Structures are given as structure tokens and as C-alpha cells.
TrEMBL record, chain B:
It comes from Apis mellifera (Honeybee). This is Apidaecin. It comes from the Eukaryota. The chain holds residues 18 to 31 of 199 of the full protein. Belongs to the apidaecin family. It is found in: Secreted.
Length: 142, 14, 110, 56, 103, 47, 117, 150
RNA sequence: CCCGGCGAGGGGAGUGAAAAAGAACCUGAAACCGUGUACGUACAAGCAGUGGGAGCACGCUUAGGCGUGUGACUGCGUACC
RNA sequence: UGUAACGGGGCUAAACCAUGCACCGAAGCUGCGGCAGCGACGCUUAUGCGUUGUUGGGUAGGGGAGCGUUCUGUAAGCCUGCGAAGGUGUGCUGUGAGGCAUGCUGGAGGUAUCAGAAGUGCGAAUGCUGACAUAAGUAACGAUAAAGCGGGUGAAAAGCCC
């Protein structure tokens, strides 16, 4: 017999709300990425997206230890010969707080079409309110 | 053909 | 049912004749004749002559009724090339290919 | 100046994906003679907008 | 109703009436072979896990067929070292139909 | 019969053919090694 | 005796071009490119008959880890507990049961937990 | 190969593979690399080896009952019909008749039967003895052959 | 006989065992170039395969699936001499 | 050139030290199936083991065993117009070179077996010959002395004739 493989049409995905208030960025992100990839399910198939949809609330209230509040720097290149730009963790949180969680989880996710599809299931929000009440998301304390 | 032109001289790497 | 007309060894490049032949495919022969009439291509002249020969073969050998007749198939195969010599600068010689094509039009009542 | 690899049938057809001819969208029927013609062009018998203009 | 038993150095989870491809057995093509080393019985919710083997678990099967699998092509190649080597392989199997599972 | 005669075993040795692929052993330098005097055609020193 | 090599050469090239089917461009059309593509396909098949066993074992292990953590134990503790309980079931069957019979997998988990206790 | 010894093109400067002869065996219409010469393929057979092979072949024919010994084998006229009827009487189709000394009548009669040969006792060979299904020797032929093979 | 320029070329007819034997003529390979159909492909990065693998199309069967084509996604993977 | 001196995310333990128990992890070892080499031992004859231990990465290179091609004998045999060789698919089959069968095409040759001989096997040699690609429907259309219009002929006229 061949081993079971999850089928994209049959895969059932659930909705969860996580509150990032006071959570350590990286550990919250590891749990987020694991559940987005679907490794918490016995049906986990590496080429199928078996993960769940996760709403992340209060992304601006995520925590970092040490001096990472000021010392952690996010670099990106704009594609122009001087275009190396950087923002500290504070500036990232102030300007776009959801980008912090999203960048962490995107780094922890696989790289490729399936990793991008998985990332599309993350719904980071800066505040305590989301608009996916229609999806009936269950509270996930991770 | 019957006539092959001499190739142009290389850059004088001297 | 289906009627073929071919212009074999048509003195034209298959690429250009294919440009013209893509215009009339699965179209009624009337629309195709209009299109080839108002296409400004030597290949359009060639393909129109072949399509008219096909319509005539259909109405003379296979039955009748130009009206119920579409260009079901049309394709352009490459034919034999004529090799020519062209002198270039400094004693060099290139080979020109006078490329030809076989134009085939299959009309049908479907 | 010259290629380092020969391009493929795929690249060749992708480049020629813009070479396709556009057929004339519609022909005009003459007011008087009822002949087909291009918009704003006389017919093959010399009519334009219902009047004999050339008499060729 | 399924049972887990090891036959050819590897284990199989089988149900009654289903056909299983094993490594080659030394049994004729119409004989009943018994695997009395069943690692597990399920029978719905009454799951018997065997401490190494279930005590009375026995899987009776009928040797349906002997055969050779699809030909695999072994290709060994050392680039720039003037060495290549090709080999064929058809692995022998015994297909058996599970006729009975007695816990 | 004229088609049922056979040579003794070990009587014919089947000959050694150079430069006929990888599997044959010999092939690509046919047992000459690599570039040198003795690998050349008509090469090798006198007695 | 002059030997012409057209029939044998054609057969030998067709043999390779038939294995090169489905390959892109010259890889399926042209013997020089097709022959290299078939040799590397054979190399890859040889290497991947090994990597297949590796990949399936790591898939089974990931699924057993998921189901065991659903039951409240890590993969390493679960496997240690099954070793202590003398359960010989392998990772292939364990992952099959994890997917298809969650009750039997919970039974195996309780057995491993009892062996660890 | 017919042709001149001129270098087809100069050694350097052209982007062409270096050539020296239009008659090169790499070239179409060039020479054969190791062209055949008329050679003699006949090999030596030791007298004793040849005679031992003849003795072995005759022994094998006797063991296989392919050797038929007779007195006189003659035909009264050079008639293929006569010899064919005689062989059909003797139940023979593919036969090698070895006679004491060659009879002109028998030779002429056998000349047109392709499954029938007629040798002199001195003119027997291993390939014929093995190739014909039956070997009919006269008594004089048998005596001459045993003298020749002693 | 028909289309065509009293063309080229072709479609019929007829000859012939055969005309994809029509003289550009036995067979008629490959490269190369097309038409049609099935599947895939316009958010995805690299020797283009290989291991896994859904879906779809088609051919069977008894209903388990098998075969054929394609191949989303995914692990690994920098040609040959 | 751009973070650019953890592979990255990220980590205050997911760092380091110490102790311990688990687990993962290779083509290593074990399990099951298969093939081959060598040795020992019996089997008595020559080989097969109903045995057995062990070995089996490999360039240069040495040794051993084969496949297939053309031609000669076997062969005035055998196959073949109820379809040969060749071509093109399919299925089966062998450890491999390969083989076998068969559909379509083809239209007259082919050849068992066992021997014999080799112009006996190609991807490379800036190889040779032919064919066909690519660049590409691109550059160019050869003096910047220059054309315009009317009529004619013609299937068609910027270019021919007037
Ligand atoms: Mg990776
Ligand atoms: Mg000049
Ligand atoms: Mg274009
Ligand atoms: Mg040597
Ligand atoms: Mg060398
Ligand atoms: Mg050296
Ligand atoms: Mg040397
Ligand atoms: Mg010959
Ligand atoms: Mg010659
Ligand atoms: Mg002598
Ligand atoms: Mg005609
Ligand atoms: Mg034919
Ligand atoms: Mg003939
Ligand atoms: Mg032909
Ligand atoms: Mg072809
Ligand atoms: Mg995007
Ligand atoms: Mg897409
Ligand atoms: Mg790309
Ligand atoms: Mg892949
Ligand atoms: Mg810098
Ligand atoms: Mg372990
Ligand atoms: Mg392993
Ligand atoms: Mg090993
Ligand atoms: Mg073993
Ligand atoms: Mg070895
Ligand atoms: Mg060697
Ligand atoms: Mg022949
Ligand atoms: Mg056909
Ligand atoms: Mg040769
Ligand atoms: Mg080579
Ligand atoms: Mg070459
Ligand atoms: Mg060119
Ligand atoms: Mg081009
Ligand atoms: Mg350009
Ligand atoms: Mg330009
Ligand atoms: Mg220009
Ligand atoms: Mg100009
Ligand atoms: Mg000019
Ligand atoms: Mg004028
Ligand atoms: Mg002018």
C-alpha cells in the first residue's frame, strides 16, 4: 500500500485567532508557521497545504527580549544601487506593526509557491479587532 | 570557398 | 464532404503565408474571401487563389452550395528551397534560400 | 553581437506571438451599389457613399 | 477490521479479502500461508496491540501469484572518468489474498 | 555434419579489439595509457 | 566484408530517444542531448531509490510526531515508550494508523505512556 | 586514391579543422584507412593431422552408417537417367561415389546430378566426406583409401 | 471536365496491382517545419530531470483499482567530452 | 554592488558549561528477496549442493565472458506475394549488449543452427559529405541625378510602351 497523501480538495482548514499581546515574537512565529504549514496534523503532506487559517490580533503588542526593541534591524534593498534601507524594530512597529509578525513567519515558512500559499492564510492585524467573524475563528492560545 | 581571408590581427598583448 | 485544393511550390515563405492563413480558419468561405480581398499581402493573393480553387473543386466535383462551406483546414507546409549565391564584401559568399511553400485549403460543408 | 546559444522554438514562437495579422473588422456596404468596400474608400466599381465618383 | 503483520522484513496492515504484494515466499501458487506473528488487530474499537506479537493473532492468506515487478534500470556513471555501467532488475514478489484474520 | 563441428574449448581466443567503447575495457586509448611516446601511432623506442 | 551501420545505428539511437520522451526540446528530439538526459535520468533514479526510503521515513516520522503530540506526547518519547513496551510496529504502519485509525493510535499512545510510566 | 597531394587549405588562420590531404580516410572519397590487399588465406595442415582427420571422418561415417561399400559401381552408358535410376534403386539421393579409377560413363552421368558427386579414391576430401549424406565407396576405393591413410 | 493568367499549381476522371508508383516518380528514416486533439502553463526564479504527487482527459474492469497522456505542488539535483 | 563575520527566520535560551536519558540521522550495520566471484567441504566422476564462509566503489591498466552487424559454408535446406528486407508503433522478455512476437507501412527478398572471416559497433577528432535549423522575417536591396501625371497593354503597372 502507498502511504496516505492529503488531497488539496479534501483538506479541511480551520480558523483560529491568536493574540500577539506580550508573546515573544520568534516563539509565537514558530507556532504560527508550524500551524500554517500543517505540521500539527497527522495528515501533514509536504507538498499539500494542510495548515489552518490564523488571525493574529494585536501585532503591535508583540514582545522582544534583550535590546531587540531598538537593536533589531530589518534590512531591505529597493533594487537601486544605493537602495539598502533599514528600520529598527521600534520603527517597524510604529510604521507597520503587522510587518513584524509577517516577516518573522515568512522567514520561518518554506520558500516557494507552497510557502507563499501558506503565508496567504496568515491574517495579522495591528489591533484587537478583525472582520472575519463570519469565519467563526476559534481562540488559539499559542 | 577557395579564398579564406586572413583574420584581423589580435590586439597586441605585448 | 471535404474538398482540398493545394498550391504546391508556391513561391513564398511559409512564415508569411502562415501569417495570412491564420486569418481564415474555421470561417465561412464568403468571409474568408472578403478577408483575403482586403488583406494587403502577396500571400493573401496566393491563399485567395487556392481557396477559390477549393470552392470550385467543391462545387464541381463534390457537390455544390458555396454558402454551406467553411475553411475547415488550412495549413502551409514548407517546400523545397532554391539555393542561390549572393556575393558579400571581401570575397565572401552567402547562400540565399528562395523558400517556397505548399498551401493547402480544405473546405467542407461540415 | 551574436548569440551564445541558439534560441528555441518556444522563444521563436513567443516572439512571433505579436506578428499575427489583424483582419479588417468589418466591410462597408455601399448605399447605392450595395458593394463591399473599406470605410472611406471607393468601391471597386467607383461608388462612394452612394454616388458614382470615378466611373473607372 | 485490520491487522498488522511483518512478512518480508517489512510490515503490512491488511484487511480480509484484500491482496498484498510481499517479498517472494517459498510457497506454491495455491497454498495457504499463515502469519502467526500478528503485531496488531483492530476489529473496530477493540484494538489489540501485541507485546511483540498478539498471542493468538493469526493471518491466513492464499498465495495468489508469483511474479517479477517492473524492470528497474540501474545506471552508474562517473563523468569524465570513462566509466558507466547499466544493469536491469526485476524483483520477485508473491501476491497473497488475505482470507482470514483471527485475533 | 558440416554445421555440427566445433573447435576445442580454449582453441580460439576471440581477439582483442581496441577503441570500441567503455564496456569493452579497451576503448579511448585502447590500453596505451595517456599521452606519451608509447601512446603515439608508430611510437615507442627501439630495442 | 564491408559492414554498413545504418540499421544498427538507427535502432541504437531510437532506443535512447524513446527513453527521452517527455523531455524538453532537444532533450527529447536530438540524440546527443537526449543521450545525456537519459544517463542523468538513470543516475537520478539510482540516487532517488535511496532518497525515496529516506523521504518516506521522514514523512512517517513527521506524521507520527503530529498525531502523538495531538495525543499529548512527543515523537521521541512515544518511540521510546513503544520500545519499552516491546511494540515492533514500524513508522510506516504507525503513520498509516495515525491517519486512518485515530482510536488505535490513541491506544498505542497510552501503551507507550504506560511503558514510560 | 586518385588526387593530388596539395594541402586543401592552409594550416592556420582558417576556422577549419586542420587538413593535409584530400585523400584522408576521414574525408569522403578518401582512402580506406587499412585498405585490403589480395591475401592468401590457405593455412597449413600437418600431413599427420590431415590424415588423422580423414581417418576420424571415415570412422564417424562408419559409426553413423553413412558409408556404403560395394563392388563395381558403373553404368553402361553416359546417361544421367541411368545413374538416377540406379541411385533411386539403391535408395540414394545425396551421395558421394568414390570409385577405384574414374569411369567416363559414370562421370558424365553424374555430372548433371547436383546431389551426386563422383570422386577418384585419390580425390577425396574431408568437406565432401562430411557434406554428402551418403558415401558409396567401391571395394577398390576402400583398398586405395586404406593404403593412402596407412 | 473544373479552378486558375490559353499560367504555375491543384481537384476530379481515366490507366495501372498500386498514382501518399504522376515523372519534384521504389522504399521513404532523422534532424527541421506545421495542422489537429488531451493535459499543463500568464506571482513564478536556475543542467529542466528524478523521487513523491493531486487534478484532468481517455481506454478497461468491477467496482479495488489498472493502463495511457498530462503534470499543479513538493524533496533532491550546477550538461557531456 | 546589498543586510552580508548564526545559511536564514528568529533566539536571552533556540547561547555556553556540566551531568543524564531519549530521539533523528548514511548507499554504515541489521532484516527480507535476488545475482555474481572466490575458497573450503562434501556429490563422484566432469557438475549440481539439496552446503558453507567470504567477497562484489573504481581511473590508467591486466584478466574472463558475451551481444549485435556484413559476408562464406551448412543452404538446390528453411521462411516468404496467404507478404521478405527496410521503416514505424505496441507488447513481452533477458544482468547487459539485446532478443521475441505482432499491428500499420513496404512490395522481394531473408535466413535457423553450428562453424568461419572481418571495411564489425561513433557524440565528440575547430572530423568529412549532404540536409536542415538559429540569429530573423532581422540587416540589406549597391552612389542622395528625381521624379509627377494622363493614356495604352495586361490577370495584375511606381518600374514596360506612348
Ligand atoms: Mg531548501
Ligand atoms: Mg571581388
Ligand atoms: Mg514581431
Ligand atoms: Mg597496455
Ligand atoms: Mg587523449
Ligand atoms: Mg603525463
Ligand atoms: Mg605512457
Ligand atoms: Mg556487402
Ligand atoms: Mg573511395
Ligand atoms: Mg604437401
Ligand atoms: Mg488535371
Ligand atoms: Mg505505397
Ligand atoms: Mg519493384
Ligand atoms: Mg518515394
Ligand atoms: Mg519524418
Ligand atoms: Mg507576491
Ligand atoms: Mg499561477
Ligand atoms: Mg526563468
Ligand atoms: Mg520536481
Ligand atoms: Mg554597506
Ligand atoms: Mg533510533
Ligand atoms: Mg537508511
Ligand atoms: Mg552494505
Ligand atoms: Mg540477503
Ligand atoms: Mg568492481
Ligand atoms: Mg580500465
Ligand atoms: Mg541482405
Ligand atoms: Mg495508413
Ligand atoms: Mg569502422
Ligand atoms: Mg567519445
Ligand atoms: Mg563531428
Ligand atoms: Mg545558416
Ligand atoms: Mg528565421
Ligand atoms: Mg535583432
Ligand atoms: Mg531594426
Ligand atoms: Mg533597411
Ligand atoms: Mg538605397
Ligand atoms: Mg539601385
Ligand atoms: Mg502612369
Ligand atoms: Mg523609379
Amino acid at each position: 500500500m502507498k502511504t496516505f497523501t492529503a488531497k488539496p480538495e479534501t483538506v479541511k482548514r480551520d480558523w483560529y485567532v491568536v493574540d500577539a499581546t506580550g508573546k515573544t515574537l520568534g516563539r509565537l512565529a514558530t507556532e504560527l508557521a508550524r500551524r500554517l504549514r500543517g505540521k500539527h496534523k497527522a495528515e501533514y503532506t509536504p507538498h499539500v497545504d494542510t495548515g489552518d487559517y490564523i488571525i493574529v490580533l494585536n501585532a503591535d503588542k508583540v514582545a522582544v527580549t534583550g535590546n531587540k526593541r531598538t537593536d533589531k534591524v530589518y534590512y531591505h534593498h529597493t533594487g537601486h544601487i544605493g537602495g539598502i534601507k533599514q528600520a529598527t524594530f521600534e520603527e517597524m512597529i510604529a510604521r507597520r506593526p503587522e510587518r513584524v509578525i509577517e516577516i518573522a513567519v515568512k522567514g520561518m515558512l518554506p520558500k516557494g509557491p507552497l510557502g507563499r500559499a501558506m503565508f496567504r492564510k496568515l491574517k495579522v492585524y495591528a489591533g484587537n479587532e478583525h472582520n472575519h467573524a463570519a469565519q467563526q475563528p476559534q481562540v488559539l492560545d499559542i | 570557398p577557395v579564398y579564406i581571408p586572413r583574420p584581423r590581427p589580435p590586439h597586441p598583448r605585448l | 464532404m471535404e474538398t482540398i485544393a493545394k498550391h504546391r511550390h508556391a513561391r513564398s515563405s511559409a512564415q508569411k503565408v502562415r501569417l495570412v492563413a491564420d486569418l481564415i480558419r474555421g470561417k465561412k468561405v464568403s468571409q474568408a474571401l472578403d478577408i483575403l480581398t482586403y488583406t494587403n499581402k502577396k500571400a493573401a493573393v496566393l491563399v485567395k487563389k487556392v481557396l477559390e480553387s477549393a470552392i470550385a473543386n467543391a462545387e464541381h466535383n463534390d457537390g455544390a452550395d458555396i454558402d454551406d462551406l467553411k475553411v475547415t483546414k488550412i495549413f502551409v507546409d514548407e517546400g523545397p528551397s532554391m539555393k542561390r549565391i549572393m556575393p558579400r564584401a571581401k570575397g565572401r559568399a552567402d547562400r540565399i534560400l528562395k523558400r517556397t511553400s505548399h498551401i493547402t485549403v480544405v473546405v467542407s460543408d461540415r | 553581437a551574436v548569440q551564445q546559444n541558439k534560441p528555441t522554438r518556444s522563444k521563436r514562437g513567443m516572439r512571433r506571438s505579436h506578428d499575427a495579422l489583424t483582419a479588417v473588422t468589418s466591410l462597408s456596404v455601399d448605399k447605392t451599389s450595395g458593394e463591399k468596400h473599406l470605410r472611406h474608400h471607393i468601391t471597386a466599381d467607383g461608388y462612394y457613399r452612394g454616388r458614382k465618383v470615378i466611373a473607372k | 477490521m485490520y491487522a498488522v503483520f511483518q512478512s518480508g522484513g517489512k510490515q503490512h496492515r491488511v484487511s480480509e479479502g484484500q491482496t498484498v504484494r510481499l517479498e517472494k515466499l517459498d510457497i506454491a501458487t495455491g497454498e495457504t500461508v499463515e502469519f502467526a506473528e500478528v503485531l496488531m488487530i483492530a476489529n473496530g474499537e477493540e484494538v489489540k496491540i501485541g507485546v511483540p506479537f498478539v498471542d493468538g493473532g493469526v493471518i491466513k492468506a492464499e498465495v495468489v501469484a508469483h511474479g517479477r515487478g517492473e524492470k528497474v534500470k540501474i545506471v552508474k556513471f562517473r563523468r569524465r572518468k570513462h566509466y558507466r555501467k547499466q544493469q536491469g532488475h526485476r524483483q520477485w514478489f508473491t501476491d497473497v489474498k488475505i482470507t482470514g484474520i483471527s485475533a | 555434419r558440416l554445421n555440427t563441428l566445433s573447435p576445442a574449448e580454449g582453441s580460439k581466443k576471440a581477439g582483442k579489439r581496441l577503441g570500441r567503447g567503455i564496456g569493452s575495457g579497451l576503448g579511448k586509448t585502447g590500453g596505451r595509457g595517456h599521452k606519451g611516446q608509447k601512446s603515439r601511432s608508430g611510437g615507442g623506442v627501439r630495442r | 566484408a564491408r559492414v554498413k551501420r545504418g540499421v544498427i545505428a538507427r535502432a541504437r539511437h531510437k532506443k535512447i530517444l524513446k527513453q527521452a520522451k517527455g523531455y524538453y526540446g532537444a532533450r527529447s528530439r536530438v540524440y546527443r542531448v537526449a543521450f545525456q538526459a537519459v544517463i542523468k535520468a538513470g543516475q537520478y533514479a539510482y540516487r532517488d531509490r535511496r532518497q525515496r526510503k529516506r523521504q518516506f521515513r521522514q514523512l512517517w516520522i513527521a506524521r507520527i510526531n503530529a498525531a502523538a503530540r495531538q495525543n499529548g506526547i512527543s515523537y521521541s518519547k512515544f518511540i521510546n515508550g513503544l520500545k519499552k513496551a516491546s511494540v515492533e510496529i514500524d513508522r510506516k504502519i504507525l503513520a498509516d494508523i495515525a491517519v486512518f485509525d485515530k482510536v488505535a493510535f490513541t491506544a498505542l499512545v497510552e501503551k507507550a505512556k504506560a511503558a514510560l510510566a | 586514391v586518385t588526387g593530388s597531394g596539395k594541402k586543401p587549405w592552409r594550416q592556420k588562420g582558417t576556422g577549419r579543422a586542420r587538413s593535409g590531404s584530400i585523400k584522408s580516410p576521414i574525408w569522403r572519397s578518401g582512402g580506406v584507412t587499412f585498405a585490403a590487399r589480395p591475401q592468401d588465406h590457405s593455412q597449413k595442415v600437418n600431413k599427420k593431422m590431415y590424415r588423422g582427420a580423414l581417418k576420424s571422418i571415415l570412422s564417424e561415417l562408419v559409426r553413423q552408417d553413412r558409408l556404403i561399400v560395394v563392388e563395381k559401381f558403373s553404368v553402361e552408358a553416359p546417361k544421367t537417367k541411368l545413374l538416377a535410376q540406379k541411385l533411386k534403386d539403391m535408395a540414394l539421393e545425396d551421395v558421394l561415389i568414390i570409385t577405384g579409377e574414374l569411369d567416363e560413363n559414370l562421370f558424365l552421368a553424374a555430372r548433371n546430378l547436383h546431389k551426386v558427386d563422383v570422386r577418384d579414391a585419390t580425390g577425396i576430401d574431408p568437406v565432401s566426406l562430411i557434406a554428402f549424406d551418403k558415401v558409396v565407396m567401391t571395394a577398390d576405393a576402400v583398398k586405395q583409401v586404406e593404403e593412402m591413410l596407412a
